[PDB]
Design a protein around this motif. Structure first.
Motif, PDB file in Angstrom:
ATOM      1  N   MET A  74       0.818  -1.207   0.000  1.00 41.87           N
ATOM      2  CA  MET A  74       0.000   0.000   0.000  1.00 41.87           C
ATOM      3  C   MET A  74       0.855   1.263   0.000  1.00 41.87           C
ATOM      4  SD  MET A  74      -3.310  -0.823   2.376  1.00 41.87           S
ATOM      5  CE  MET A  74      -3.948   0.771   1.865  1.00 41.87           C
ATOM      6  N   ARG A  75       2.005   1.232   0.677  1.00 43.26           N
ATOM      7  CA  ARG A  75       2.811   2.438   0.837  1.00 43.26           C
ATOM      8  C   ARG A  75       3.418   2.890  -0.486  1.00 43.26           C
ATOM      9  NH1 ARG A  75       7.568   1.624   4.991  1.00 43.26           N
ATOM     10  NH2 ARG A  75       7.536  -0.302   3.755  1.00 43.26           N
ATOM     11  N   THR A  76       4.039   1.970  -1.222  1.00 44.41           N
ATOM     12  CA  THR A  76       4.713   2.336  -2.460  1.00 44.41           C
ATOM     13  C   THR A  76       3.803   2.286  -3.677  1.00 44.41           C
ATOM     14  OG1 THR A  76       6.747   1.994  -3.726  1.00 44.41           O
ATOM     15  CG2 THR A  76       5.471   0.046  -3.141  1.00 44.41           C
ATOM     16  N   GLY A  77       2.633   1.662  -3.571  1.00 48.46           N
ATOM     17  CA  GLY A  77       1.719   1.589  -4.689  1.00 48.46           C
ATOM     18  C   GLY A  77       2.126   0.649  -5.799  1.00 48.46           C
ATOM     19  N   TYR A 126       2.632  -2.901  -7.845  1.00 48.05           N
ATOM     20  CA  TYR A 126       1.934  -4.176  -7.974  1.00 48.05           C
ATOM     21  C   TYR A 126       2.624  -5.100  -8.971  1.00 48.05           C
ATOM     22  CZ  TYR A 126      -1.882  -1.679  -5.655  1.00 48.05           C
ATOM     23  OH  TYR A 126      -2.639  -0.940  -4.776  1.00 48.05           O
TER      24      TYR A 126
END
Lengths: 49, 49, 49
Positions: free
Chosen positions: A6-9, A11
């Motif tokens: 979630m922090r770095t986005g 995937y």
């Protein structure tokens, strides 16, 4: 790590690991939904989320 | 059915087209590379070419 | 003089396609949360909190 996810986005790694159908492990906090039907057990629905 | 001058004009226009195929790699490398290398931004390809 | 055997000619072209010029509607860039932004050295953009 879900926190980093979630922090770095990013995937990238997770998507490529899941698409090729390879084992993965995720560690992090997640709310749960309880299902107590053997119909749900036989008809696989624990992986479609 | 045309005169040689007109046919030469039209054929030169036809064979010297300015358009090139657009691949996912081409549209990905057309985006500036420094922004791609970043981690603050995430570039995801969603539309289907 | 109008000669038919040389005035006749065949054209060459592609069947059909669409013109694309924008080249930016096919990419999406969602920013990370503003608090957790890092720099080139993998340290956070603002290290004061």
């Amino acid at each position: 790590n879900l926190e980093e996810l979630m922090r770095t986005g990013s995937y990238a790694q997770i998507t490529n690991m899941l698409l090729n159908n390879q084992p993965v492990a995720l560690v992090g906090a997640l709310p749960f939904v309880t299902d107590s039907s053997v119909i749900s057990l036989i008809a696989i629905l624990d992986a479609t989320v | 059915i045309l005169h040689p001058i007109d046919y030469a004009f039209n054929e030169y226009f036809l064979q010297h087209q300015l358009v090139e195929p657009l691949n996912n790699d081409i549209i990905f490398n057309y985006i500036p590379e420094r922004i791609r290398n970043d981690v603050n931004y995430i570039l995801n390809m969603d539309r289907n070419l | 003089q109008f000669d038919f055997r040389n005035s006749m000619h065949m054209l060459t072209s592609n069947l059909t396609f669409t013109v694309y010029s924008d080249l930016l509607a096919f990419v999406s860039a969602d920013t990370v949360e503003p608090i957790n932004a890092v720099a080139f050295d993998n340290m956070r953009i603002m290290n004061e909190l």
